[PDB]
Amino acid sequence: VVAAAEKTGVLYVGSKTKEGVVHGVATVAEKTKEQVTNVGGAVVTGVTAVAQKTVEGAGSIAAATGFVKK
Amino acid sequence: VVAAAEKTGVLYVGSKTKEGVVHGVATVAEKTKEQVTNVGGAVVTGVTAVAQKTVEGAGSIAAATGFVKK
Amino acid sequence: VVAAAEKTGVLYVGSKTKEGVVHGVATVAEKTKEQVTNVGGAVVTGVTAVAQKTVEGAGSIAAATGFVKK
Amino acid sequence: VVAAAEKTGVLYVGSKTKEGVVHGVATVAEKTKEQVTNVGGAVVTGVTAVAQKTVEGAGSIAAATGFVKK
Amino acid sequence: VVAAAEKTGVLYVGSKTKEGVVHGVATVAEKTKEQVTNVGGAVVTGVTAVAQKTVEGAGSIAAATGFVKK
Amino acid sequence: VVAAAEKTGVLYVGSKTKEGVVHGVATVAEKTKEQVTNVGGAVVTGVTAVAQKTVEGAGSIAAATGFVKK
Amino acid sequence: VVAAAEKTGVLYVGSKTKEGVVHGVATVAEKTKEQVTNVGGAVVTGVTAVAQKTVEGAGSIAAATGFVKK
Amino acid sequence: VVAAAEKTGVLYVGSKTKEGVVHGVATVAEKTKEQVTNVGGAVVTGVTAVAQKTVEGAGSIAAATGFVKK
Amino acid sequence: VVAAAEKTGVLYVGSKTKEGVVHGVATVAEKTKEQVTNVGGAVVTGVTAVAQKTVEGAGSIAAATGFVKK
Amino acid sequence: VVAAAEKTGVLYVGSKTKEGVVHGVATVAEKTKEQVTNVGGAVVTGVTAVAQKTVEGAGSIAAATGFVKK
Amino acid sequence: VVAAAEKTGVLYVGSKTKEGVVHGVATVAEKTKEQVTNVGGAVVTGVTAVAQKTVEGAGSIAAATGFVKK
Amino acid sequence: VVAAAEKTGVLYVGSKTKEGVVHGVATVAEKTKEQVTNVGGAVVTGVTAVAQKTVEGAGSIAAATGFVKK
């Protein structure tokens, strides 16, 4: 990701990179009702405007696993 | 991520990088109701405007695991 | 992440990096109701405007684990 | 992260880095109600405007674990 | 993180770094009600505008563990 | 983190670093009510505008552990 | 607009009226461009989420009149 | 607008009226550009979330008149 | 606007009125640009979250008149 | 606006009125630019969270008049 | 605006009135730029969280008049 | 505005009135720039958290008039 300029009216050199980006979000919630009953499991709810970048590893967003037995 | 300029009217050289970025979020909540009953498990709720960058490791956002038994 | 300039009207050289960044968030909550009952488990709720950068380690935001038994 | 300039009207050289940064947050809460009942577990709630950078270690924000038994 | 300048009208050389930084936060709370009942567990609530940088160690913000038994 | 300048109108050389910094926070609370009942556990609440830098050690902010038994 | 109840499990009597009401609006604008050149006239633009109730009078929203000559 | 109740488990009597009301609005604007050039006229722009109730009079929102000559 | 109750488990009598009311507004603006050039006229811009009630008079919000000549 | 109660478990009588009221507003502005050039006229800009009640008189919010000549 | 109670477990009688009221406002501004050049006119800018009640008189908020000549 | 109670467990009678009231405001400004050049006119800027009640007179907040000539 390099930018190089050599001069010997306007000169512009640009490199832009976006990875894992969230922008420009508007939400309205009125009179909403939510009930969760969980017995021995996993519940994930209500996830909004989330950004993540991972290098050399697993990347998980809003992941639910009931249980692991070994 | 380098920027180099050599001169021997306006000269601009630029490199920009965004990784795991959240911006520009507006939320309104009115008269919302939420009930959670959890017995021996995991519940995740209401996650907003979260950004994360991870190098050489696992990256988790809003992760629920009921239980682990070994 | 380097910036270099050599001159022998305006010269600008710039490198910018953003990793794990949250900005520009506005929230309004009116007359909201929330009830949590937890028995022997894990509950995570109401997480907003959180940023994290991790190097050579696991990175977790809003993570719930009911219990671990070995 | 270096900046170097050599001259032999305006010369500007700049390097900027942001890692784990939160800025520009406005919140209003009116007449909100929250009840938590916890018996032998873990509850995390109401986390806002939190930034963290970790090197060579695990990084956790808003993490709940019910209990650990060995 | 170095800045170097050599001259043999305006010359500016700059390096800026931000790691684990929170700035620009405004909050208003009116007539809010909060009740917590905890029996043998852990409860964390109401965390705002917190910044942390950790080197060669675990970094935790708003972490709840019900109990540890060995 | 070094700054070096050599001259043989305005010359400026600067290096700035911020790690674990909180600034610019305004909060208003009116007629808020909070009740905590704790029996044999741990409760943490109401944490605002906290900054920490740790080297070669664990860094914890707003951490609750119900109890440890060995 | 009256509500009357007489008792000699649940009894509910209700009258609700809404006149000139706007609610539940979410808008996002990114990279928009707007140019207005006006010479001796009237220009109205960009009107959103406006509510009005008028009794015994004229009610105008987003009204433009170039000029009036008598 | 009256509510009357006479008793000789739950009894509720209610009258609610809303006139000229705006609620629940979320807006995000990023990188918007606006230019206005006005010579001897009237320009109105950028009006959001406005509510008005008028009795025995004219009610105007976002009204532009270039000029009046008598 | 009256409420009357006569008793000779729960009895509730209520009258509520809202006139000219704005509530629950969240806005974010990033990198916006605005230029106004006005010569002998009137310009109104950027009006948000405004409420007004007028009795026996004219009610104007965001009104522009270039000029009046008599 | 009257409330009357006569008793010869819970009895509640209530009258509530709101006229010209603004509440629950959150705004964030970052890197915004505004330029105004005015020659012999009127400019109004940047009006937020304003409430007004007027009896037997004209009520104006964000009103611009270039000039009046008689 | 009267409240009357006569008794011959809990009895509550209440009348509440709000006229021209602003409450619950949070604003953040970062790196904003504003320039005003005015020659013989009127400029009004940056008005926030203003409340007014007027009886038997004109009520003006953020009003600009270039000039008056008689 | 009267409250009257006659008794011949808890009895509460209450009348509350708010006119021209501002409460619960939080503002943060960082690195803002403002320039005003005024020649023979009027400029008003930066008005926040202002409340006013006027009886039998004109009520003005943030009013600018360039000049008056008779």
Swiss-Prot record, chains A, B, C, D, E, F, G, H, I, J, K, L:
Residues carrying Phosphoserine: S60
Sequence repeat ranges per the UniProt record: 15-29, 30-40
Keyword Cell inner membrane: no
Compartments reported by the entry: Cytoplasm; Membrane; Nucleus; Synapse
Stretch list, region 4 X 11 AA tandem repeats of [EGS]-K-T-K-[EQ]-[GQ]-V-X(4): 6-40
GO biological process, alphabetically ordered: adult locomotory behavior; amyloid fibril formation; behavioral response to cocaine; cellular response to copper ion; cellular response to epinephrine stimulus; cellular response to fibroblast growth factor stimulus; cellular response to oxidative stress; chemical synaptic transmission
Tissue occurrence: Highly expressed in presynaptic terminals in the central nervous system. Expressed principally in brain.
Residue numbers binding Cu cation: H23
Keywords in alphabetical order: Acetylation, Alzheimer disease, Amyloid, Cell projection, Copper, Cytoplasm, Disease variant, Membrane, Metal-binding, Neurodegeneration, Nucleus, Parkinson disease, Parkinsonism, Phosphoprotein, Repeat, Secreted, Synapse, Ubl conjugation
One function term, GO molecular function aspect: zinc ion binding
PTM field: Phosphorylated, predominantly on serine residues. Phosphorylation by CK1 appears to occur on residues distinct from the residue phosphorylated by other kinases. Hallmark lesions of neurodegenerative synucleinopathies contain alpha-synuclein that is modified by nitration of tyrosine residues and possibly by dityrosine cross-linking to generated stable oligomers.
GO cellular component term of the entry, any: perinuclear region of cytoplasm
Domain remark from Swiss-Prot or TrEMBL: The 'non A-beta component of Alzheimer disease amyloid plaque' domain (NAC domain) is involved in fibrils formation. The middle hydrophobic region forms the core of the filaments. The C-terminus may regulate aggregation and determine the diameter of the filaments.
Disease: Genetic alterations of SNCA resulting in aberrant polymerization into fibrils, are associated with several neurodegenerative diseases (synucleinopathies). SNCA fibrillar aggregates represent the major non A-beta component of Alzheimer disease amyloid plaque, and a major component of Lewy body inclusions. They are also found within Lewy body (LB)-like intraneuronal inclusions, glial inclusions and axonal spheroids in neurodegeneration with brain iron accumulation type 1.
Functional note: Neuronal protein that plays several roles in synaptic activity such as regulation of synaptic vesicle trafficking and subsequent neurotransmitter release. Participates as a monomer in synaptic vesicle exocytosis by enhancing vesicle priming, fusion and dilation of exocytotic fusion pores. Mechanistically, acts by increasing local Ca(2+) release from microdomains which is essential for the enhancement of ATP-induced exocytosis.
Assembly and interaction partners: Soluble monomer. Homotetramer. A dynamic intracellular population of tetramers and monomers coexists normally and the tetramer plays an essential role in maintaining homeostasis. Interacts with UCHL1. Interacts with phospholipase D and histones. Interacts (via N-terminus) with synphilin-1/SNCAIP; this interaction promotes formation of SNCA inclusions in the cytoplasm. Interacts with CALM1. Interacts with STXBP1; this interaction controls SNCA self-replicating aggregation. Interacts with SNARE components VAMP2 and SNAP25; these interactions allows SNARE complex assembly and integrity.
Family per similarity comment: Belongs to the synuclein family.
Protein name stated in the entry: Alpha-synuclein
Source organism of the structure: Homo sapiens (Human)
Whole sequence portion shown: 15 to 97 of 140
